[PDB]
Design an enzyme around this catalytic site. Sequence first.
Site, PDB file in Angstrom:
ATOM      1  N   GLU A 131       0.797  -1.236   0.000  1.00 41.10           N
ATOM      2  CA  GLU A 131       0.000   0.000   0.000  1.00 41.10           C
ATOM      3  C   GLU A 131       0.834   1.294   0.000  1.00 41.10           C
ATOM      4  O   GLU A 131       0.579   2.214   0.782  1.00 41.10           O
ATOM      5  CB  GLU A 131      -1.008  -0.008   1.159  1.00 41.10           C
ATOM      6  N   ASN A 172       2.153  -5.314  -3.182  1.00 43.24           N
ATOM      7  CA  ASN A 172       0.734  -5.524  -2.885  1.00 43.24           C
ATOM      8  C   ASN A 172       0.002  -4.203  -2.651  1.00 43.24           C
ATOM      9  O   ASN A 172       0.519  -3.323  -1.958  1.00 43.24           O
ATOM     10  CB  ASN A 172       0.614  -6.426  -1.644  1.00 43.24           C
ATOM     11  N   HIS A 208     -10.316  -5.740  -2.836  1.00 46.95           N
ATOM     12  CA  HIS A 208     -11.400  -5.378  -1.936  1.00 46.95           C
ATOM     13  C   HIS A 208     -12.404  -4.572  -2.751  1.00 46.95           C
ATOM     14  O   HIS A 208     -12.268  -3.357  -2.907  1.00 46.95           O
ATOM     15  CB  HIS A 208     -10.900  -4.588  -0.715  1.00 46.95           C
ATOM     16  N   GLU A 245      -6.413 -10.488  -1.625  1.00 48.96           N
ATOM     17  CA  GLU A 245      -7.259 -10.232  -0.451  1.00 48.96           C
ATOM     18  C   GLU A 245      -8.729 -10.111  -0.848  1.00 48.96           C
ATOM     19  O   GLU A 245      -9.474  -9.285  -0.308  1.00 48.96           O
ATOM     20  CB  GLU A 245      -6.776  -8.975   0.295  1.00 48.96           C
ATOM     21  N   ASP A 247     -12.423  -9.845  -1.444  1.00 48.13           N
ATOM     22  CA  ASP A 247     -13.757  -9.847  -0.858  1.00 48.13           C
ATOM     23  C   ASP A 247     -14.598  -8.800  -1.572  1.00 48.13           C
ATOM     24  O   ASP A 247     -14.067  -7.831  -2.116  1.00 48.13           O
ATOM     25  CB  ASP A 247     -13.762  -9.664   0.680  1.00 48.13           C
TER      26      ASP A 247
END
Length: 327
Positions: A131, A172, A208, A245, A247
């Site tokens: 990030e 990432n 996400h 990740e 979702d």
Amino acid sequence: AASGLEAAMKAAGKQYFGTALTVRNDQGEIDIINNKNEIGSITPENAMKWEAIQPNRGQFNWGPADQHAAAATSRGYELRCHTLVWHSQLPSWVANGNWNNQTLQAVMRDHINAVMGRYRGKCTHWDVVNEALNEDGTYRDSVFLRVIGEAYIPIAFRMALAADPTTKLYYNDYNLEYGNAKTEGAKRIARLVKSYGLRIDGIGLQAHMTSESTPTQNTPTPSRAKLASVLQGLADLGVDVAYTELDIRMNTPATQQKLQTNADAYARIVGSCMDVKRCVGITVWGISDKYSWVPGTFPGEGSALLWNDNFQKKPSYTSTLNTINRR
Ligand SMILES: *[C@@H]1O[C@H](CO)[C@@H](O[C@@H]2O[C@H](CO)[C@@H](O[C@@H]3O[C@H](CO)[C@@H](O)[C@H](O)[C@@H]3O)[C@H](O)[C@H]2NC(C)=O)[C@H](O)[C@H]1NC(C)=O
């Protein structure tokens, strides 16, 4: 057709289907994970972040990380190690330290050496930098950027390569899926590492997403074809890609309509991975909605995972499995 996600990925020529994990007394998620046809990779949810691993300077905390690593190794599963250099939840001694360029680098080196060294031959992937970007694609302000400048990113990758060359070195980040300025930033990062003659093995797209407009994310999961072009564009640089990740959240409560719409969203993004050769695998951020970060971080949002609070498969599970199994 294969009956579990991991088996489906393997049959399709992909490397793994994985999940984030927190080891807890509730066995609901782990009992699902135990199925070797269901899951083949684990990402420790919190046990390997800087605060968890070195909460005080020189005093490493191996217990939780060892426990989570063992959850994967004892089952012969892959392990995504998460994460080395990250602005969030830095220990106070790092974040508020009085650093110069040389002294912060020595701190980076010591941390990276010790944690990568311990889990060498166990960590399949490492999220080396996490990030590092603002939403507009410029570099996110942190102690690493302030003290070392842009060069902290390639330096982190240089240190990581030295500590464990056998792992896959990943950058990432979230919100790279939309093909905008932030996506461009990730490319700039990959270009920069390669410019130093250094190795970047992959780019992790956190994924996400949402299945409808929410207050935090107005743009729902893009088209299968758009996501595929974003993935390939990143792969063009000479790196693997992976959804790390995954979702897909909605405004709660769920309804049957929303659950089906959410299932369609899963099909699109999962399909995008199927479309791109260099997309090696998918990791969802947890098995069950029961323990998802979403409702606590963003109240009113949730229902983001493949199994519900009762550890029952949601429509998204079926759409995901079918999409992997397609032709
Ligand atoms: C802190 O110290 C480090 C060195 O320990 C400095 O890193 C150096 O930064 C420069 C850019 O400012 C790097 O240069 C670049 O090299 C690549 C290829 O080699 C080239 O593509 C670029 O155009 C540029 O010339 C240099 O490699 C790098 N040195 C090392 C050893 O990594 C850093 O600048 C210092 N930070 C501050 C804020 O002073």
